[PDB]
Amino acid sequence: AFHTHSGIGVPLRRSNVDTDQIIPAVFLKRVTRTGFEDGLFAGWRSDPAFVLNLSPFDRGSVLVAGPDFGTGSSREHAVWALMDYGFRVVISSRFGDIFRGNAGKAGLLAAEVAQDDVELLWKLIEQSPGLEITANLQDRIITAATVVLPFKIDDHSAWRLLEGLD
């Protein structure tokens, strides 16, 4: 279940965010499957001025990231970390291939959007922290304030999300 998700958008101006940054290896074991929320961005969250430590971004569930998010040797874990923290949508102009595949299978919506449109969303969120971004899977659009943007997702991913096979 899910044709639409709404949540506080979190601006993250970082390119080539790789698996190790999303969830550091020290947190992993191979049979563990719960409680990855503390390991999400665990290194970056050491700084009290990291965006995820700031209200109201600390309660966000829609992540707006730089190009090539989820890059490197992806992990189901990286997707697990985001999900456990409470993020249901990641927006980027380009995803790591392995990461994108894994996202849909895991109940996380990875929306690819034009970079022009990424910089646009960053501005909205940064001028108005708390602004909510909506992702509509039926129409394949992202909405923020009165700005409406198309996004791409492969139909197999869409089908897994819509069928709620999380």
CA angle 21, 22, 25 (to 5 degrees): 70
Maximum separation of any 2 CA atoms in the chain, in Å: 45
Which residues are bridge partners to 147 per DSSP? 144
CA distances from 92 to 29, 51, 78, 84, 164 (A): 29, 17, 15, 20, 23
Scan for tokens 């909405």, then name that residue: 143
Instruction: Count CA within 13 A, CB hemisphere, residue 97.
Output: 0
**Residue 8: beta bridge partners?**
132
Q: In whole angstroms, what is the distance from residue 63 CA to residue 51 CA?
A: 11
Q: How far apart are CA 112 and CA 104, in angstroms?
A: 13
Handedness of CA 13, 100, 24, 51 (dihedral sign): positive
- H/E element, 158: helix 155-162
Dihedral of CA atoms 102, 106, 109, 111 in degrees, nearest 10, equals 0
DSSP state of 44: G
- The total domain count for the chain is 1
- The one-letter code for the residue type at 63 is L
For residue 88, the domain's CATH number is: 3.20.19.10
User: Can you read off the two tokens belonging to residue 1?
Assistant: 């279940």
Give me the amino acid identity at 131.
Answer: L
* Contact status, residue 19 vs residue 70, Cβ threshold 8 Å: yes
Closest CA to 124 of 4, 8, 1: 8
SS (H, E, C) 67-132: CCECECCCCHHHHHHHHHHCCCEEEECCECHHHHHHHHHCCCEEEECCHHHHHHHHHHHHHCCCCE
Q: Are 133 and 7 in contact (CB under 8 A)?
A: yes
Resolution in angstroms comes to 2.5
Method: X-ray
Domain that holds residue 164: 1-166
